[PDB]
A paper describes a structure:
After screening various DNA substrates, we successfully determined the structures of [name] in complex with an 83-nucleotide (nt) [name], a 28-nt target DNA strand, and a 12-nt nontarget strand containing different [name] sequences, [name], CGG, TGA and TGC, at resolutions of 2.90 Å, 2.70 Å, 3.20 Å, and 3.01 Å, respectively. Six of the seven mutated residues are located in the REC lobe, including A262T in the REC1 domain; R324L, S409I, and E480K in the REC2 domain; as well as E543D and M694I in the REC3 domain; additionally, the mutation E1219V is located in the CTD domain. Intriguingly, in the structures of [name] in complex with canonical PAMs ([name] and CGG), the conformations of R1333 and R1335 are similar to those observed in the structure of WT [name] in complex with NGG PAMs, demonstrating that [name] utilizes distinct modes for the recognition of different PAMs. In contrast, the structures of [name] in complex with canonical NGG PAMs are virtually identical to those of WT [name]. However, our work reveals that [name] remains in the same conformation as WT [name] when it recognizes canonical NGG PAMs, even though the DNA fidelity of [name] towards NGG targets was improved. This result implies that the enhanced DNA specificity of [name] may not result from the REC lobe conformational rearrangement but is likely the result of the mutations of residues that weaken the interactions between [name] and the DNA substrate.
When the RNA-guided [name] endonuclease is in complex with a mature CRISPR RNA (crRNA) and a transactivating crRNA (tracrRNA) or a chimeric single-guide RNA ([name]), [name] is capable of cleaving any genomic locus in a programmable manner when a protospacer adjacent motif ([name]) is present.
Numbering used by the authors: 3 to 714, 719 to 765, 774 to 1011, 1030 to 1050, 1059 to 1244, 1249 to 1367
The structure:
Amino acid sequence: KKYSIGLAIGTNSVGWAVITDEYKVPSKKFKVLGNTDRHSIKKNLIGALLFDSGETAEATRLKRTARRRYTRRKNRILYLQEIFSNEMAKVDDSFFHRLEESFLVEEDKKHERHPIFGNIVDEVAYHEKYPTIYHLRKKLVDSTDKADLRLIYLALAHMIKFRGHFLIEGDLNPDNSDVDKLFIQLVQTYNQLFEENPINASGVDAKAILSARLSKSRRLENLIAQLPGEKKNGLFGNLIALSLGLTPNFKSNFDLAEDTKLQLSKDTYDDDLDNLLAQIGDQYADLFLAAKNLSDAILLSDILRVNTEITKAPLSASMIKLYDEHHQDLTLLKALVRQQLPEKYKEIFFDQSKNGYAGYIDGGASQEEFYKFIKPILEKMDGTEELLVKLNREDLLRKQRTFDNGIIPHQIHLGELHAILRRQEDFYPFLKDNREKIEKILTFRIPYYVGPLARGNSRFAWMTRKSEETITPWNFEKVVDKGASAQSFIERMTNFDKNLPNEKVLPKHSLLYEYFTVYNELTKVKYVTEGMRKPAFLSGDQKKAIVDLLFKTNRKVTVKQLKEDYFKKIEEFDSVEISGVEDRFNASLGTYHDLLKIIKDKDFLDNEENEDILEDIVLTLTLFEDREMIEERLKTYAHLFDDKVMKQLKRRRYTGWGRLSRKLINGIRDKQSGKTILDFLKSDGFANRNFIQLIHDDSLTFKEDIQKAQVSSLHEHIANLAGSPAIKKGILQTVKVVDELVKVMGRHKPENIVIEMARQKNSRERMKRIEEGIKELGSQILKEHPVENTQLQNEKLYLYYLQNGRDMYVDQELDINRLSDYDVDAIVPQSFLKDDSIDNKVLTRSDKNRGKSDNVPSEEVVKKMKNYWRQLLNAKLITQRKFDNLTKAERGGLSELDKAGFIKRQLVETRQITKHVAQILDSRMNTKYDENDKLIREVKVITLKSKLVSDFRKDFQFYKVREINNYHHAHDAYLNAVVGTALIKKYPKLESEFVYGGKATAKYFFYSNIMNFFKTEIKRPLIETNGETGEIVWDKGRDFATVRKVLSMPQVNIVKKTEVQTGGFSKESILPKRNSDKLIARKKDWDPKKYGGFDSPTVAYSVLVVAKVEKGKSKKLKSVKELLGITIMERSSFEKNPIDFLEAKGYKEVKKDLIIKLPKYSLFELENGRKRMLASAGVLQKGNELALPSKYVNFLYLASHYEKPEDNEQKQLFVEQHKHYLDEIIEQISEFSKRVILADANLDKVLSAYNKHRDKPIREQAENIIHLFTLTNLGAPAAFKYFDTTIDRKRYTSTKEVLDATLIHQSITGLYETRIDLSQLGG
RNA sequence: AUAACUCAAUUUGUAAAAAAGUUUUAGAGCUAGAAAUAGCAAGUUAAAAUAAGGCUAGUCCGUUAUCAACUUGAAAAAGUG
DNA sequence: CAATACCATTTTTTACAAATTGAGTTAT
DNA sequence: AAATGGTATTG
């Protein structure tokens, strides 16, 4: 009867195995359904499910969000055309019709092909008069002359259409009138205070140097160069840093506590300056007044590059300069190339294919790809003197529309938009009467806290309407309830009190929430002086004066402060030792301080009779981020407060939510005492009970009242876990294999389920962290050893850069060409912890400079190096986590208790996800209750870490070569079943730690050697028993034997999950027109032979048609049987009317009741047990698994790594003994590949390659056999090298063979099969 | 194994915005030549599209999750060896 | 037909909630 | 960011 289940949960596989008492995996006979002459079959009960990874929702979200951007922009232009409609009709009554149809070829147009003026003469004139839209924008803001309404419309729409960013708050004037003189206010203002060291400002080029071709950061160097006697990381260089945008550590300058860096563009600034002027005197905020005064003019000096005075359109103006420069520079290049390099000319100005000018303009070639091409050419030429300097500044042959217009803020565009409207309203009454409407089209933007402006049909939407009626930029305030919405943007995402679940958690920053937080910490602090028997609790009256005096005076109260400023100065205990708070209090009344600073009244804060209000001010400050919406919900408390203080309060924003409600903390009462949880926290006699205590104390009513308030699908339940969708698929799927396994085993539940789980992109992150770290350190190491951002994947190199080219342990400089000669020491060593992240890795010359292997780095090191570790800590070149580990010896080091914990954790799974799995399964298997009404545990769910079985394999030579076939997942699921059951059969003490439901040295010893009852020598006999019960746990002579024979089994149930494909319709590339029945219409009317489209759709699923097709002039019907791929785009109509779809496709008399859905991976058996999986309507995949014998597996293992004590003779010799296992392994690929692969050319190439490399080492030949298994791997064909010969993939490019094959429909285990012969369907 | 707090790092989900890219058209190409073709002149800008589309008609929705077969269900999901 | 080869939309900002891992304090 | 099905070209 009795059996167990093993599972191995991955992202692309669940391995499963069924085992019985003797660790044997049984075999059974299962029915075989459908129409073959096979009615049944034998199956070993070991297998795996394979699947393509499930995916994150992000891609889908990003496309959705852009979709909405598109439909909104379209409506901006529509809002504008509607305003223009009635007056544009009088000037030219088809203008908007022939913008709408500009894209159509001349023969699909209703109107004249010339869009603006609807005739050629006037259109040619327009373009030579205004080469760029920028020429026209400028003209229309500067000229006073009445303008063509069409030329007005075009300037407004292009400002409204490409309208720049919403990242600066509020209004904006261009003042670059005095970058010369705004700077020269700063130097007399600083030269008034620092009269000792007066900066020699002759104002030599303040205008130029800040605001030059090259960067901001660089240009500071170039000003402090033309000022003599001045550190650039010094007070005048610090002010100028800020004036640009860079942040300086500013600490040095004034002798202060912490690194103090501002950016004058952050909103954080207003307040942050005053944090510093509180130190140095409000008598030097005129050094940060003359700072903004130049910071204004310089903000925009990278875009705008025209002295504004001479234009109100400095953006369009600059653009015109880029053009004019582009014209003058090009005409020069065209002279030079023709006097100096005539041969090349053609290539550079005609041949698009190459990245010359033609390639830049009419080819597909980047501003960058261009520059690269012609740097070679420009300098093999004595004329490019001033023209090559332009290339390096990136100022050469610039377009106006480019990657770097990212920076233009919407206010700039609004500047010119507003200007034009001021001009032409003087002549167009409707522009006067709609100036504000039109501007609101450019300006309005739905708030992130409002989301889609839906009406009952967006599962994304939360917005409320004060009124049903259409929302427009102009009626949004009056129709959207912005507060209701601003609130539910948050409330729909925030927790309910897990204890009182109809209650919403308080703001993290609520005054009440912070009170609860200290009293909980403070209630379990205890103290001692001499003359006291025991240490006592703090009392009620004691906690109050500590709260009243220290907590409401300092943000942080340090333990020093509690000792000195309390026990000495009130309690008169000159020496007091205290337990429960270790350096400073975790808890703090941060909100009491932030408020009393701004509100300025302790008598109001401390007054209990106005609590509800203060709780509604912090709720208003936490919910909302829109300083305006705050003000509106804060205005009702304007009687109670000073006007100067709403100024402060409105800005006092807060962020974060608690885990507990007001009702719990301070509403709900103990029946007896009538006292709230916070009441007990404030005073609880001599018991001083915690939060967690009061909640579990049967003498109190909290325990049962929480029991009262507590309340009550699978598919749903799994998708609500916190893990990667990729793991959440493996999760669901395993539950489904376990449900099927329980059925094959006759509804009988298992004795046990043993689960276990596994553990350019990160090349930009690293270089971005490397730059910012050194840029912060001010190190010249990237000047001295420049690096792309793709070699920093070499962990030795990356660590070298993350350590500023220094040894992490000794304070030597690290030679960057001797990383070969150097070591990567784990901080917490490998012995204790399996972390391979950079958080535990450290590059040193030798690893022995940490000191002793058997602990954290020496105290020696920790005190010598610490200073430099914090340099890297501030730099973000290490984490607080890394830094804490590195230093641990100074806080005692790795305690024998820590060490045990680290070897226990090598064996017991912590991961919260794997626990949920174990729980899901436990709660799913164990559903019955006994007479007394307690849950009967039929099934035991045992959680193992991978390391156990990985060891076990390495320890009794059950080696896995992952690349041989998909069997290893099933193998691990078996080994997890046996090692699982065997471990709790020997040690029922360990069900505590694996089943769901001097002290350190011993524990440590036990765990280190736990798995020894499998070994014979460390002494121990063949037969192993439980001491107490005397069960059998391992017939060591006979039981490994059964493991061998299970792993040697060739018939393992592999199943690839068949999957209807979903996602994007096709490749996204909008291809040019060609005559080709592959191009796909981007819109109904856009015939792609004229307009281009898409070429490369995804088949959602293939379908088997048996029908007839017309043939010849005659239309004489002929019978067809083939696959038609149904495209993702086609699918919904195919499904709507299966016939009318296929009939419209060509097919006739389509036999409706023979159509078969064949999603991707649908499996087919041909001849010789050769099988193929569908990849598409036209492409097959390798369907067979190659079942290499055990003996060859292990030989390939040991061979591949000869880099492996006295056992390395016996293991290393086996290899040289069985050199002829190679020929025998090659022959076994050949028999296989000849029978099922059918790649005649590729087998010939591997055969030759092999025979050609036979005089090479046994190691080098095993590394490369291990490559050949790609030839034979289940799945899509793929390339691989045998040594230096590549064998490109032999693909399956027709599905015709499967139409007469056997379709095999598999259950999820693959044990239940329906088999269809397609030879019996085709008429 | 669990709770609250503190700090750091991570991952998941949502909303609002921006800049390019690509596509067709418009920006009279000239001269010599029967033509092939040659010489030359030009180039930087715009419009419109950006999943086909869909009804629920919103400034909404349209790429995630879920899916052997048979029987039963709109479905979810149950039954079946 | 087979062998062969080339191709795949990209970047950027702001606002927010949750869970999880792991170094601490207090506990059931 | 591969990997692998769409696509075209060619032998």
